[PDB]
Amino acid sequence: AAPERLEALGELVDATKRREVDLQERFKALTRRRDELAAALAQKRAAAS
Amino acid sequence: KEGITRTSNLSAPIIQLSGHAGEVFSMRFSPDGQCIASGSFDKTIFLWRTYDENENYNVIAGHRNAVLEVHWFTDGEALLSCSADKTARCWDAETGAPIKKMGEHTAVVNSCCPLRRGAKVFVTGADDSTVKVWDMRVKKSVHTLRSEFPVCAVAFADAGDQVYSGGVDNAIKVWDLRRGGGADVEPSMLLKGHSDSVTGLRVSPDGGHLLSNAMDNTLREWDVRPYAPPNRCTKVFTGHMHNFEKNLLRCDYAADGSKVACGSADRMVYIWDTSTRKLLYKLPGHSGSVNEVVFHSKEPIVASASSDKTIFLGELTQ
Amino acid sequence: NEHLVDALPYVDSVPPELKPHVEALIEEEKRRSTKLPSDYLREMPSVRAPKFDDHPVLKTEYERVRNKEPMAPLDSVRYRLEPPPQARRGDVGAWKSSLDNAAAQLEHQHLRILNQELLLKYGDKAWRAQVALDEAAVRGLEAQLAALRKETDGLNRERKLQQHAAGSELSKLERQYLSQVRKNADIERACDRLEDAVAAMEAELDTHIR
Numbered sequence: 001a002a003p004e005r006l007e008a009l010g011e012l013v014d015a016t017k018r019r020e021v022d023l024q025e026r027f028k029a030l031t032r033r034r035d036e037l038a039a040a041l042a043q044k045r046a047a048a049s
Numbered sequence: 050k051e052g053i054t055r056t057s058n059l060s061a062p063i064i065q066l067s068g069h070a071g072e073v074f075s076m077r078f079s080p081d082g083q084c085i086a087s088g089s090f091d092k093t094i095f096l097w098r099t100y101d102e103n104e105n106y107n108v109i110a111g112h113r114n115a116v117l118e119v120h121w122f123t124d125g126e127a128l129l130s131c132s133a134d135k136t137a138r139c140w141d142a143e144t145g146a147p148i149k150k151m152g153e154h155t156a157v158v159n160s161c162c163p164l165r166r167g168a169k170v171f172v173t174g175a176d177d178s179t180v181k182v183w184d185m186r187v188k189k190s191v192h193t194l195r196s197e198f199p200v201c202a203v204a205f206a207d208a209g210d211q212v213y214s215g216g217v218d219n220a221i222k223v224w225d226l227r228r229g230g231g232a233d234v235e236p237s238m239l240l241k242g243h244s245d246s247v248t249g250l251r252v253s254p255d256g257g258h259l260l261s262n263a264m265d266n267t268l269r270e271w272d273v274r275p276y277a278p279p280n281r282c283t284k285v286f287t288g289h290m291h292n293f294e295k296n297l298l299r300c301d302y303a304a305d306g307s308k309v310a311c312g313s314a315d316r317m318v319y320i321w322d323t324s325t326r327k328l329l330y331k332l333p334g335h336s337g338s339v340n341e342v343v344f345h346s347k348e349p350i351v352a353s354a355s356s357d358k359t360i361f362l363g364e365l366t367q
Numbered sequence: 368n369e370h371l372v373d374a375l376p377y378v379d380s381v382p383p384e385l386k387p388h389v390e391a392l393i394e395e396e397k398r399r400s401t402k403l404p405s406d407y408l409r410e411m412p413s414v415r416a417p418k419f420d421d422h423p424v425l426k427t428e429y430e431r432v433r434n435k436e437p438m439a440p441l442d443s444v445r446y447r448l449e450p451p452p453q454a455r456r457g458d459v460g461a462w463k464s465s466l467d468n469a470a471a472q473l474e475h476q477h478l479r480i481l482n483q484e485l486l487l488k489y490g491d492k493a494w495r496a497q498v499a500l501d502e503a504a505v506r507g508l509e510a511q512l513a514a515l516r517k518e519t520d521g522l523n524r525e526r527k528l529q530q531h532a533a534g535s536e537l538s539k540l541e542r543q544y545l546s547q548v549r550k551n552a553d554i555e556r557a558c559d560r561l562e563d564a565v566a567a568m569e570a571e572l573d574t575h576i577r
Contacts, residue, residue, distance in 0.1 A: 001373045002533035009540040018561045023554035027276045030560050037567045044574050276553055 056364040057348045058071070058100055063334070066097055066352075066360035068105050073354040074297055075118040075341045080125045082346035084142070086359055088116035094130055096142065099345070103362065109140055111147050117297055120163050120171070129171050131161035137173050139185070151183060153190050156232030159297060160203040160250070161213075167209040174200030181216040182226055192226050194234055201297070202249050206273065207256025211237070213273075215247030221261055223273065240271045241349055242282045247290070253306060258283070260300040262311050264291035268300070268321070270309075286321050288328050289313035292338070295354060299341035303349065308365075310342035310351055318342055318353045318361070377527050424577030448472045 056064070071090030078085065078099070085097035092112040114134035121128055127148065128140045136152035156176030163171035169185030176199040182192035198218035205212060216220030240261070244357045249262035261269045261322035270284030291298060292314040301310045308318045310327060318339055320330035330351070337357030344351055352362040381389070397403065408414075414439075419425035448468055451461035486493075 001371045002375065002529060006533060006536050006540070009537060010518070013540050013544055013547065016544070016551075020547060020550050020554075023551070023557065024274055024276055027554065027557045030557060030564060031275060034560065034564050034567070037564060037571070040571050041423070041567075044571070276557060 053366055055124040056366065057345075057350050059103075059350070059362070059364065060101075061363075062366070063361060063363035064103055065334075066095075066103060066105075066362055067358070068108075069358040069360075070097055071115065071358060072296075072337065072356035073340060073358060073360055074115060074356075075299065076343050076352065076360060077119050077121050078343050078345050078352065079121055080123065080346060082348075084125065085120075085321070085352065085360070085362070086119045086121060086128055086142075087354060088119040088130060089358070090356075091230075092116055092132065092134070094119060094128070094230040097360075097362075099350075099362070107142075107145050109145055109147075111138060111140075111150075111347050112136065114157075117157070117159055120161065122163055122169060125166055129161060129163045129170075131158045131173055133157040135175075137171075137183070149185070149188075151188070153181065154179070156199070156359055159199075159201055162204040162250070162252075164171070164205045164209050165203055165207065165252075169203070170209075172203045172205045172212050172214075174203035174214045174216070176200070178216075179362065180212060180224065182212065192199055192343070193232065194224055194226075194292050195232070196197055196222065196236075202247050202253050202261075202299070203346065204259070205249040207252055211273075213252075213259055215240075215243075215250055215261055217246045219243065219245060221247050221250070221259075221271075238273075238281070240281055242269055242271075242280075243267065246295075248297055250311075251300035254304065255306065258306075260302060260309060262289075262298050262300045264295065264298075266291050268309065270323070284323070286311070286326060288321070288331070289319045290315040294338050294356070296338050296340055298338070301342050301344055303344045304346055308344070308349075310344060310353075312339035312341050312353065312355075314338040316355065316357075318351065320351060320365070321365060329367070330365060332361070332363075335359070373532060375530040377530040378537075446472070 066085065066087065069087065069089040069091060070093075073087055073247040075091045076085065076087045083096070083099045085099060087095040087097065089095070092110070092114050094116055096107040096110045097103055097105050109128075112130065112132040112134050113136075114132055116130050116132045118131040119128065121142075122139075126142050128142050129137065130140065131137045135154050135156060135158060136150055137148045137154075137158050139148040140146065141148055154173065154175040154177060158173050158175040160175075160355070161171055163169070170183065170191070172180060172182050172293060174180040174278050176197040178200060180194050180196065180200050180203055181190045181339065184191040188328060194212075194214075196214065196216065196218065198216050200214050201216040203212065203214045210225060210227055212224050212226055213221060219241070221240045221243070222236040223240070224234065224323065225237050228234065228237070240259075243263040244265040244267070246264045247261050248264055249260075251260040253259065257272055257274050259271050259273050261271065263269065266287070266289060268284075268286030268289065270286075272283050273280045275283070286309065289298075289311045290313045294314055296314065298312045298314065302323075303309070307323060308320050309323050310318065313319055316335045316337060316339060318330065318332035318335065319328065320332070320342075321327060322329045332351075332353070335353065335355040335357055336359075337355045339353050339355050342351060342353045349365045350363065351365060352360060354360045395414055417425065417429050419429075450456075450465045450469070451458070455461040
């Protein structure tokens with residue numbers, strides 16, 4: 001019984017950390033375009049004056 | 050007699066590697082775990098087999114000063130050697146010939162790390178406070194960032210876009226190379242918490258964790274996940290030592306992230322269990338400061354390199 | 368025919384007030400159980416009739432014995448060793464019956480006294496030996512008990528060690544699942560930043576038309 005639940009909880013933690021990997025990659029691309037947007041705001045104001 | 054559960058195929062559970070004629074400053078296991086690249090103070094690289102003789106089947110020469118840091122390239126046939134003679138060198142392992150010698154740095158090229166996923170690219174940080182990124186097939190350096198204080202330890206991240214550099218300036222920095230195509234980029238992340246210089250940097254086997262050995266006699270574990278708490282500091286290890294030698298004492302993760310090994314100046318091979326943050330193995334046997342420790346790619350084998358011209362090569366029992 | 372449907376019992380202690388709860392759940396489990404027999408011995412092997420169809424002896428033996436009506440003790444009235452009564456006195460064949468019983472009991476008591484004299488003369492060390500053998504069986508049996516106790520205890524200890532080697536890994540796997548949960552909440556605030564970044568982008572197109 002013991003090893004089947006260790007891998008029956010092991011592989012599940014693995015799967016939602018696969019989630020976690022995708023998820024923080026989303027955070028990566030997110031703050032990336034965030035800083036891109038901050039730079040766009042900066043230059044549009046620096047152009048307007 | 051004593052029959053304690055032989056882990057590896059090595060003839061014995063503790064093997065000393067001799068043949069060097071200087072301090073051994075950095076070592077590395079082949080990705081396929083059957084080679085040793087040992088770089089000594091004698092400006093020479095010994096290539097050992099990990100099994101069946103431990104035969105140093107080749108001594109590659111060509112640096113004019115101590116080869117401070119060695120990694121292997123992702124396929125294991127090309128080697129990246131970094132030295133004090135201001136020259137980093139790419140060699141072919143099977144052959145005994147040097148492939149590409151780039152010497153763009155002005156002072157001792159302390160630290161280097163070749164990228165593990167992507168192209169044949171390696172970072173090198175030297176005494177000029179500049180951390181430079183080097184692509185294999187171009188003969189110019191592809192990137193060059195300038196800190197103000199001599200670079201001691203550098204690593205390339207798991208994913209391949211940022212560079213970690215830590216030195217005498219009491220703070221380790223993470224820089225973004227694609228964010229920087231200019232010659233005076235400013236640092237992205239400032240991991241603080243070491244109380245003096247950083248000496249060694251290892252990227253975790255998942256890439257979310259960075260290990261820093263400090264002459265703060267402290268191993269610190271930080272997380273590099275772009276979504277972190279305000280303090281990226283996770284773990285602290287006590288136990289090893291740094292002394293007046295100020296050697297390049299490094300970090301390593303076990304191939305599983307389960308242990309962390311540090312080289313120390315008290316001649317001891319330290320191996321902590323990362324989770325409980327406590328000392329699993331404290332192996333004696335080295336007569337000089339332990340410079341770098343490397344965990345064998347497959348088995349729990351640990352091999353250490355010291356400033357005593359030898360390398361102990363053995364397996365862990367518990 | 369279930370395979371190891373088990374949660375480890377040295378790790379997973381059943382709570383005090385969970386006995387009534389788990390009891391009620393098992394009770395309602397019973398309530399609408401599929402084929403509730405409580406005589407499910409039907410699927411159990413047929414417990415067969417007592418196999419003496421070739422000895423009427425044990426046949427009648429069991430037919431009476433289940434009624435427990437005992438056999439009478441053997442012929443106590445003849446044992447009192449009496450000659451023919453009033454209505455049997457005059458007839459001599461009755462005194463032949465008396466010859467039978469009187470002579471039989473005479474030699475009964477004779478070989479009786481012979482056996483008794485034979486043991487009290489001889490038997491002493493025989494009883495010595497057989498009581499020694501009863502003590503030998505005694506101590507051997509308790510030795511078997513101590514052994515069985517020992518081996519079983521060792522197995523139990525091994526089981527406990529195995530339970531410990533698992534419960535720790537299970538517990539930590541679940542706590543890191545909870546940390547994976549908080550990591551999900553982190554990426555929820557990431558989705559917050561997704562909304563915020565799009566709202567921020569909702570200014571560049573504005574300036575673009577402006």
